[PDB]
Amino acid sequence: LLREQFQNPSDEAKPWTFWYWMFGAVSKEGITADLEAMKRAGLGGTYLMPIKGIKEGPQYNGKAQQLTPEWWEMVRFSMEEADRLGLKLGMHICDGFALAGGPWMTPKESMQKIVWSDTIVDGGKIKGLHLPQPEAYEGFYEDISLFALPVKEEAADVMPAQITCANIATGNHIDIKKTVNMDDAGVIRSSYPCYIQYEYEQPFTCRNIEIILSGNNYQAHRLKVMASDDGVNYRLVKQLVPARQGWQNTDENSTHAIPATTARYFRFYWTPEGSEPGSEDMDAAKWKPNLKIKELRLHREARLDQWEGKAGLVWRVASSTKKEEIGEQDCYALSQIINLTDPFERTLTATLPKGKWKLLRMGHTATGHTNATAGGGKGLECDKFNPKAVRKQFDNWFAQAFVKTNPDVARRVLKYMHVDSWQCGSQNWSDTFAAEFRKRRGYDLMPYLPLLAGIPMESAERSEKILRDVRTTIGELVVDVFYQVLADCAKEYDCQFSAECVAPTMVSDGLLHYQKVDLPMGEFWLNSPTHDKPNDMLDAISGAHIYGKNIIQAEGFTEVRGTWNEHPGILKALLDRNYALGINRLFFHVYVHNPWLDRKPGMTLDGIGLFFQRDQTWWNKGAKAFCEYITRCQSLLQYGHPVADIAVFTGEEMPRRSILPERLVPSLPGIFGAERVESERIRLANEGQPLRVRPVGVTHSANMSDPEKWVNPLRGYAYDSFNKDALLRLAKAENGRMTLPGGASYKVLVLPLPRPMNPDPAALSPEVKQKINELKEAGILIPSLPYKEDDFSSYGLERDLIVPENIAWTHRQGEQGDIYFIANQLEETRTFTASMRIDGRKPECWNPVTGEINADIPYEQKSHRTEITLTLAPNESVFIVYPATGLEATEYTVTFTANGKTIQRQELFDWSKEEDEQIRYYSGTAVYKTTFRWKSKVKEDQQVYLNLGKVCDLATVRVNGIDCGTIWTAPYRADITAALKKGVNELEIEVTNTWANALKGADEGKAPFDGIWTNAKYRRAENTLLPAGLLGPLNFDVAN
Ligand SMILES: [Br-]
Ligand SMILES: [Br-]
Ligand SMILES: [Ca+2]
């Protein structure tokens, strides 16, 4: 029954934590203390993951380097203690937090890429010729083919150039030293509009520019190319366009094609005007809009536009190459190419026709990626397309946890196998790739292998059709090999399989892998706009919904710079909007193991939060009460199936992933509303490229999308993104709706306009065209775009929930009835109407903070909907469920637990404004004791609240020794009804703040007690003491 799930939730409803072991510094005494704290807070389990080793942190004197006998003894003891306490465990598939590496992997067994070497020679008879050796990682390299291409032009690929620059920006304060300049090594820097000029001795013909960088630089890809024969009259060649790109973009340079241009002078003009704001698919646009280029390489030999990404070496999306850029005469036919593979530190002997020929020697080598955050378990990443390599990774780490510990205990407690978010670049080859390509795509890749160096063949269109097939195959192999093999291994060891995202680092369909896993998992960050991953969150939730996975996990509260002012009151709105998106099992990031019992707050992940661990000031009472709210919420939010009326198709480009709401605004302007259309015009215009600092010390693009401003963006409908695999393999028409196994059922199917991640757009395959037609004939609404009405009520599809803005919500339904989660996102008390798409059933209001149920709230039935009036306090949330006078106190005694000080006061006070330093700089818990008089006996159906006024930051209330609650969020009041008596009552309130004030104290030689230490170095920029204590005033509230 719903009422007993809410009141006595199951173990599946409890949140979990990540548990990080730092630098091999681990102790048994800390393990016991940590696991007991976790059990007392009400967590269900933890994922044990060690991060770095003694080399990275020698000062900590760690005795538990990964994979040593001493380390395995800590893992065994942890398992033993988890069993005693009734907690469960998981571990990741490698040391560190990403991804699938270890010291047992050789270069041959690691991720592979196609590499090559060039040389030009005269034809006729060739004899014992040595060829240049391609890139070989640690000396590993293997030949595949050797091609001979008849040169298109005899002139050289590059020529010498005199390089100069010129500032063109005028007026006002222009820091003259930040105008364009070139250093000793040729590196070009600028913060103001400028040109860079290349002068050739004789006219040069340029077909593309290879842009080479030091790190990332969005602005480098926005140059405007101009050319001149006479040194004064210049003509426009091309405005360059940045390719879509993710945070791991540095493994390859970028080639921008132009129309073939013969000139003595090339000018590259730059301005920051017209820049796009940062996002997950233009990651470098997050950073300051300054220009920085290591080298521009102007090439003569023809190449496809942005080929590095199109060959799958790196995660990128760009437009197909225009005919103006690569025409018939720029491509090679198959009959022109002479394959010299058969003719054998090797040499070549054979004979060519007369003329000059390019000797293109192709092969493969390792990409060079490692599980970089590992300690003892660090080495090369496994080949993701090789099933024996993938199995080997499993056997050498995760499988060993059932052998090198106690095997019977391991089998009871270690029930979860995790793979985290991908951080190992991309790969475009393996020994099996040709054959896999052959079965799946229906033709041979091998004669076309020079496409993977960007050398065009037959036509531009034909070259790019095949390169898309290479990319498609890459993504298919991530799922059918790496995930498939790991899923077999997990089932063999009786483990559940959780996984986070593959996008935006590895070429993939970002949703596709979620079919092979039990527990899709997303990520959401606290106070970290440059590192948040809302598109990851939508990949995991969309994947779960379309592939029928009921439990959706999330790595929550990850904080790029923690500053020790975080407590549960300021985490609630963040959590609730991610519940509205559709997660239902939270994993806290992060609980770090503190091996010392006399250092507080102790060891952290170099100051990366959330600092969620036993030595937090608010752990004992605050972590517990938060986790109780979380468990009540998650009991209802795992019930039944989620409701979503709209499916949005993710297309046929590669790579691909779920679609962010902002990118749908041009398709559905009516649904989003005019105010959203207008605010988006202004944001994307991005006038002045404004900067924001958040957190302390992280300067970034101010107009980047903020997920807090995208609550209920379709104004009462919900959507999932939806891929070709689900369309072709799972979708079925039933009663005018598109259904999928596991409970998804959509009335609308959107085929969005061309968009930044699908700009061509990629043509729909005949099979996709066929299924869409079928679904349309069966009653599924395929709207005509742009869709301009406010909603879909014209077609019989009303909004699910009608509420005002800044109200986050979700809807679940099953045999026992319907549930709406409704949450206030503002720091304001608000009263509003909520209108739900439910006809003639009685609603109830269930309160997740307190566990109270009000089964008889007022409501009105109107036009076959149900309306209620809700009052929500700041950040307050509620579930709507449908079945099928001043205090007058004596002298306060206030006792500061951590340092034993006690004082006597008549009036309440802010700790941070006291003259005594041991109070002024205090962080921790203080116990207030007083008495008050109650006039009359408590009547029947009379309810009394003690209102606490302003609490900094949480308070537990006790009346005549009876616990009346831990108060951590609005409204700040406790129900004292049952504890009251006539006469004098005893009043005790325990109040706890955050660590900020004590750390500022300790930093300045004014620590308020002994034993303060942390490796977390970041602090609030403001340099102020925060408000602290029970500020009041205290008041009674009597009602019925
Ligand atoms: Br870049
Ligand atoms: Br897009
Ligand atoms: Ca992650």
Short mmCIF file of C-alpha atoms in Angstrom, two decimals, residues 140-413:
data_model
loop_
_atom_site.label_atom_id
_atom_site.label_comp_id
_atom_site.label_asym_id
_atom_site.label_seq_id
_atom_site.Cartn_x
_atom_site.Cartn_y
_atom_site.Cartn_z
CA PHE A 140 54.02 -0.46 -30.77
CA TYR A 141 52.89 -0.22 -34.41
CA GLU A 142 51.41 -2.56 -37.06
CA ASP A 143 51.02 -2.00 -40.82
CA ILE A 144 47.63 -2.51 -42.49
CA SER A 145 47.96 -1.23 -46.08
CA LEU A 146 50.25 0.84 -48.31
CA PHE A 147 48.64 2.97 -51.06
CA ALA A 148 50.14 4.82 -54.00
CA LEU A 149 48.34 7.98 -55.11
CA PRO A 150 49.12 9.88 -58.37
CA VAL A 151 49.76 13.49 -57.19
CA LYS A 152 47.16 16.05 -58.30
CA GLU A 153 49.68 18.89 -58.45
CA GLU A 154 53.46 18.73 -58.29
CA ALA A 155 53.84 21.87 -56.08
CA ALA A 156 54.55 21.28 -52.36
CA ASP A 157 51.82 20.96 -49.63
CA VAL A 158 53.16 23.92 -47.56
CA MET A 159 55.50 26.82 -48.31
CA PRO A 160 57.54 29.37 -46.25
CA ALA A 161 55.66 32.54 -45.17
CA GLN A 162 56.43 35.81 -43.42
CA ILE A 163 53.93 36.21 -40.58
CA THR A 164 52.91 39.64 -39.21
CA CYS A 165 49.97 41.04 -37.14
CA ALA A 166 47.90 44.20 -36.68
CA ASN A 167 45.59 45.48 -33.96
CA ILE A 168 42.42 47.10 -35.39
CA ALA A 169 40.45 47.94 -32.21
CA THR A 170 39.99 51.63 -31.36
CA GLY A 171 38.94 53.81 -28.40
CA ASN A 172 38.99 54.14 -24.61
CA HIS A 173 40.96 51.91 -22.15
CA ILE A 174 42.54 49.28 -24.39
CA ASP A 175 45.33 47.59 -22.36
CA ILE A 176 47.89 48.09 -25.14
CA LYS A 177 49.91 45.09 -23.87
CA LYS A 178 46.85 42.82 -24.54
CA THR A 179 46.55 43.83 -28.25
CA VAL A 180 47.67 41.19 -30.78
CA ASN A 181 51.22 39.85 -30.34
CA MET A 182 53.53 36.92 -31.25
CA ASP A 183 56.06 35.52 -28.74
CA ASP A 184 59.48 33.89 -29.39
CA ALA A 185 57.97 30.53 -30.25
CA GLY A 186 55.38 31.91 -32.75
CA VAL A 187 52.34 31.69 -30.42
CA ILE A 188 49.69 34.32 -31.29
CA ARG A 189 47.72 35.99 -28.44
CA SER A 190 45.05 38.70 -28.44
CA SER A 191 42.17 40.11 -26.37
CA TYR A 192 41.12 42.67 -29.06
CA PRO A 193 40.03 42.65 -32.75
CA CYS A 194 43.02 42.08 -35.03
CA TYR A 195 44.34 40.37 -38.17
CA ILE A 196 47.26 37.98 -38.67
CA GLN A 197 48.87 38.18 -42.18
CA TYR A 198 50.79 35.42 -44.06
CA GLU A 199 52.97 36.62 -47.02
CA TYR A 200 54.31 34.17 -49.67
CA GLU A 201 57.16 34.88 -52.13
CA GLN A 202 55.19 33.36 -55.03
CA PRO A 203 51.43 32.84 -55.24
CA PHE A 204 50.32 29.86 -53.07
CA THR A 205 47.20 27.74 -53.56
CA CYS A 206 45.50 26.92 -50.20
CA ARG A 207 42.62 24.43 -49.83
CA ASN A 208 42.52 24.13 -45.97
CA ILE A 209 43.95 25.53 -42.71
CA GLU A 210 45.05 23.16 -39.96
CA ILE A 211 44.61 25.01 -36.68
CA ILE A 212 47.01 23.81 -33.99
CA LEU A 213 46.50 24.77 -30.33
CA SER A 214 48.01 24.74 -26.86
CA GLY A 215 45.02 23.50 -24.81
CA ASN A 216 41.55 24.69 -25.87
CA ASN A 217 40.62 27.92 -27.69
CA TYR A 218 37.10 28.44 -29.05
CA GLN A 219 38.05 31.79 -30.57
CA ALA A 220 40.72 30.19 -32.85
CA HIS A 221 37.94 28.47 -34.84
CA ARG A 222 36.18 31.82 -35.59
CA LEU A 223 38.77 33.51 -37.88
CA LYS A 224 37.54 35.27 -41.09
CA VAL A 225 39.79 34.31 -44.02
CA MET A 226 40.65 36.96 -46.64
CA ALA A 227 43.16 36.91 -49.56
CA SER A 228 44.95 39.34 -51.90
CA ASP A 229 47.11 39.21 -55.04
CA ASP A 230 48.25 42.86 -54.97
CA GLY A 231 48.82 43.46 -51.22
CA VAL A 232 45.94 45.95 -50.80
CA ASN A 233 42.69 44.65 -52.38
CA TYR A 234 41.41 41.67 -50.30
CA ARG A 235 38.53 39.27 -51.07
CA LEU A 236 36.44 37.19 -48.62
CA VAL A 237 37.40 33.47 -48.71
CA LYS A 238 35.41 32.06 -45.72
CA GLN A 239 34.12 32.82 -42.20
CA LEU A 240 35.31 29.77 -40.20
CA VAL A 241 32.75 27.87 -38.06
CA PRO A 242 33.52 26.04 -34.81
CA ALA A 243 32.68 22.31 -34.77
CA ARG A 244 30.61 21.06 -31.83
CA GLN A 245 32.99 19.68 -29.21
CA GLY A 246 33.21 18.32 -25.66
CA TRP A 247 35.60 18.88 -22.76
CA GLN A 248 38.16 16.32 -24.00
CA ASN A 249 39.08 17.83 -27.39
CA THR A 250 42.89 18.05 -27.44
CA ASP A 251 43.93 14.66 -28.96
CA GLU A 252 43.63 16.15 -32.53
CA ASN A 253 44.11 19.42 -34.38
CA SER A 254 41.23 20.90 -36.50
CA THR A 255 41.23 21.19 -40.34
CA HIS A 256 38.93 23.88 -41.79
CA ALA A 257 38.44 23.58 -45.56
CA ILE A 258 38.08 26.64 -47.85
CA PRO A 259 37.38 27.12 -51.58
CA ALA A 260 40.75 26.70 -53.36
CA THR A 261 42.43 30.11 -53.26
CA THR A 262 45.62 31.22 -55.04
CA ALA A 263 47.23 34.32 -53.53
CA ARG A 264 50.42 35.92 -52.15
CA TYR A 265 48.69 37.30 -49.02
CA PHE A 266 46.29 35.60 -46.55
CA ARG A 267 44.78 37.64 -43.69
CA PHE A 268 43.01 35.96 -40.78
CA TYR A 269 40.65 38.52 -39.11
CA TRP A 270 39.32 37.99 -35.53
CA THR A 271 36.76 39.64 -33.25
CA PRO A 272 34.95 38.18 -30.20
CA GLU A 273 31.61 39.66 -31.52
CA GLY A 274 29.08 36.95 -32.45
CA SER A 275 30.46 34.34 -29.98
CA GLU A 276 28.14 31.57 -28.77
CA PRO A 277 27.96 31.07 -24.97
CA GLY A 278 29.49 27.96 -23.41
CA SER A 279 27.71 24.55 -23.22
CA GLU A 280 28.50 20.77 -23.05
CA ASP A 281 28.74 20.60 -26.91
CA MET A 282 30.90 23.72 -27.25
CA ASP A 283 33.00 23.26 -24.13
CA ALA A 284 35.81 25.69 -24.93
CA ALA A 285 33.28 28.59 -25.31
CA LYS A 286 32.87 28.51 -21.52
CA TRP A 287 36.26 30.25 -21.02
CA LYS A 288 37.33 33.86 -21.49
CA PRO A 289 36.86 35.09 -25.11
CA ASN A 290 40.61 35.57 -25.87
CA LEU A 291 42.39 34.36 -29.00
CA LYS A 292 45.32 31.93 -28.71
CA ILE A 293 46.95 29.96 -31.56
CA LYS A 294 50.17 27.87 -31.42
CA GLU A 295 50.32 27.47 -35.23
CA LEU A 296 48.21 27.91 -38.40
CA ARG A 297 49.24 25.46 -41.11
CA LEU A 298 48.06 26.46 -44.62
CA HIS A 299 47.78 23.27 -46.80
CA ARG A 300 47.56 22.78 -50.58
CA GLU A 301 46.48 19.07 -50.79
CA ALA A 302 42.69 18.57 -50.74
CA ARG A 303 41.03 17.40 -47.46
CA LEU A 304 37.46 17.00 -46.19
CA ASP A 305 36.21 19.74 -43.80
CA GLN A 306 36.71 18.88 -40.08
CA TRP A 307 37.87 15.33 -41.02
CA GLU A 308 39.54 14.61 -37.67
CA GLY A 309 36.09 14.39 -36.05
CA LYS A 310 34.42 12.69 -39.02
CA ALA A 311 36.93 9.78 -38.90
CA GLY A 312 36.03 9.26 -35.20
CA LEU A 313 39.38 10.20 -33.63
CA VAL A 314 37.63 12.73 -31.31
CA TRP A 315 33.98 13.57 -30.38
CA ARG A 316 32.93 16.38 -32.82
CA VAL A 317 29.96 17.39 -35.09
CA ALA A 318 30.32 19.53 -38.23
CA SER A 319 28.43 20.21 -41.48
CA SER A 320 29.08 18.11 -44.59
CA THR A 321 31.72 19.49 -46.95
CA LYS A 322 30.37 21.81 -49.71
CA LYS A 323 30.98 21.11 -53.41
CA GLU A 324 32.71 24.55 -53.66
CA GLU A 325 35.29 23.17 -51.20
CA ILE A 326 35.69 19.58 -52.53
CA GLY A 327 34.60 18.95 -56.13
CA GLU A 328 35.00 16.01 -58.55
CA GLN A 329 38.56 17.04 -59.48
CA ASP A 330 39.61 17.07 -55.76
CA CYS A 331 38.71 13.39 -55.16
CA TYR A 332 40.41 10.07 -56.10
CA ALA A 333 38.67 7.24 -58.00
CA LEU A 334 39.36 3.62 -56.95
CA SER A 335 40.95 2.88 -60.40
CA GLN A 336 43.66 5.56 -59.90
CA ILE A 337 45.00 4.06 -56.64
CA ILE A 338 47.69 1.34 -56.74
CA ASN A 339 47.66 -0.95 -53.68
CA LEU A 340 51.29 -1.95 -52.85
CA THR A 341 50.47 -3.94 -49.65
CA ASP A 342 51.62 -7.37 -50.96
CA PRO A 343 55.13 -6.15 -51.95
CA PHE A 344 56.50 -6.88 -48.42
CA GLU A 345 62.28 -1.52 -40.38
CA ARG A 346 61.03 -3.11 -43.68
CA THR A 347 61.52 -1.92 -47.34
CA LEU A 348 59.59 -1.45 -50.60
CA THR A 349 60.49 -2.78 -54.06
CA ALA A 350 58.03 -2.55 -57.01
CA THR A 351 57.41 -0.52 -60.20
CA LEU A 352 54.87 2.27 -60.82
CA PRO A 353 53.80 4.04 -64.01
CA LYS A 354 55.72 7.25 -64.73
CA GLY A 355 54.89 10.46 -62.89
CA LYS A 356 55.07 11.42 -59.19
CA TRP A 357 53.25 9.34 -56.54
CA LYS A 358 52.39 9.80 -52.84
CA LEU A 359 53.25 6.73 -50.75
CA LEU A 360 50.56 6.59 -48.05
CA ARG A 361 51.54 3.93 -45.50
CA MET A 362 48.65 3.21 -43.05
CA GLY A 363 48.63 1.27 -39.75
CA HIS A 364 47.43 1.42 -36.14
CA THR A 365 48.77 2.17 -32.65
CA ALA A 366 47.56 2.89 -29.06
CA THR A 367 45.72 6.19 -28.32
CA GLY A 368 47.85 6.76 -25.17
CA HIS A 369 45.06 6.98 -22.52
CA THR A 370 45.31 5.75 -18.93
CA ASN A 371 43.06 5.61 -15.82
CA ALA A 372 44.85 8.79 -14.81
CA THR A 373 43.30 9.18 -11.33
CA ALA A 374 44.43 5.69 -10.15
CA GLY A 375 47.23 4.92 -7.68
CA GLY A 376 48.55 1.34 -7.57
CA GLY A 377 46.02 0.21 -10.22
CA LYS A 378 47.07 2.65 -12.97
CA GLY A 379 47.83 1.77 -16.60
CA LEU A 380 46.54 1.67 -20.15
CA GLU A 381 42.82 1.78 -20.97
CA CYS A 382 41.47 -1.48 -22.50
CA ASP A 383 40.53 -1.72 -26.19
CA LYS A 384 36.79 -1.10 -26.09
CA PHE A 385 36.10 -3.14 -29.26
CA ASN A 386 38.07 -6.29 -28.12
CA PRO A 387 35.96 -8.78 -26.04
CA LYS A 388 39.07 -10.60 -24.63
CA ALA A 389 40.60 -7.29 -23.49
CA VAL A 390 37.32 -6.26 -21.82
CA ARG A 391 37.07 -9.62 -20.00
CA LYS A 392 40.69 -9.28 -18.93
CA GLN A 393 39.95 -5.86 -17.30
CA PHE A 394 37.06 -7.41 -15.32
CA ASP A 395 39.18 -10.43 -14.16
CA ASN A 396 42.08 -8.35 -12.88
CA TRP A 397 40.22 -5.82 -10.61
CA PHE A 398 36.49 -6.30 -9.85
CA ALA A 399 36.67 -10.15 -9.95
CA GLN A 400 39.69 -10.14 -7.59
CA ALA A 401 37.52 -8.60 -4.83
CA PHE A 402 35.81 -12.06 -4.50
CA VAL A 403 39.25 -13.83 -4.29
CA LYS A 404 41.76 -11.70 -2.31
CA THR A 405 39.28 -10.89 0.55
CA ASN A 406 36.86 -13.30 2.35
CA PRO A 407 34.88 -15.01 -0.51
CA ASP A 408 31.66 -15.87 1.42
CA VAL A 409 31.32 -12.29 2.83
CA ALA A 410 32.17 -10.73 -0.59
CA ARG A 411 29.21 -12.71 -2.05
CA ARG A 412 26.74 -11.33 0.52
CA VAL A 413 27.76 -7.60 0.47
#
